[PDB]
């Protein structure tokens, strides 16, 4: 299967036509997405298969072919880029200053950008092109808009 680093669409044929259920990141031979996109199911890349390796419903993350590789963090100060891959539309970088999710277990960066649910798993980048987390898990505000965490996993 295709193992080149980069951003990938996650598609299903189990509905009408081909439907984009989300996005993810191939890095060091590991495929990274959000748990709610695949629900932990296997994936096809050509006639190659990608089996789940690690996942956690609470973090809403899953890795394929190996352990989670993405370890960069939001600095807490600088503007970042959502590399949005919307359904049927080209990858487009959107630059934003993350707000904060305040939780009993600590603060998490958050990005206030509206995109369809199929964009779940698009990566968030720092100025050096490092993935600081994924887009697609968060909260719907009064505006009817979505604010997503910057979801990141742990590298062991």
């Amino acid at each position: 299967g295709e193992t080149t680093d980069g951003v990938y669409r996650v598609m299903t044929r189990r509905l009408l036509g081909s439907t984009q259920v989300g996005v993810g990141v191939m890095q060091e031979g590991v495929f990274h997405t959000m748990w709610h996109v695949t629900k932990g199911a296997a994936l096809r890349s050509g006639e190659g298969r990608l089996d789940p390796y690690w996942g956690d419903v609470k973090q809403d993350l899953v890795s394929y072919c190996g352990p989670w590789k993405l370890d960069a963090a939001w600095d807490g100060l600088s503007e970042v880029q959502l590399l949005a891959v919307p359904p049927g539309e080209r990858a487009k970088n959107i630059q934003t200053l993350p707000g904060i999710f305040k939780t009993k277990d600590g603060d998490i960066g958050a990005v206030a950008l509206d995109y369809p649910a199929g964009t779940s798993g698009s990566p968030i980048l720092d100025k050096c092109g490092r993935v600081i987390g994924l887009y697609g898990n968060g909260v719907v505000i009064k505006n009817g808009s979505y604010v997503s965490a910057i979801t990141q996993g742990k590298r062991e």
């Binding site: 080149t4 951003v7 669409r9 890349s45 891959v85 206030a112 720092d126 100025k127 968060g138």
Partner: protein, 39 residues
């Protein structure tokens, strides 16, 4: 049955479009991985 299609390189792009605000929100994370607004 789900499959992946490459969509691009992962790269910072100078003079992207710039947008979004920076809200500070009190949130709770439940065991099913769903965030909710605390007020």
């Amino acid at each position: 049955d789900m499959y992946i299609e490459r969509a691009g390189d992962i790269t910072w792009e100078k003079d992207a479009e710039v947008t979004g605000n920076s809200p500070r929100l009190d949130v709770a994370l439940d065991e099913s991985g769903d965030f909710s607004l605390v007020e």
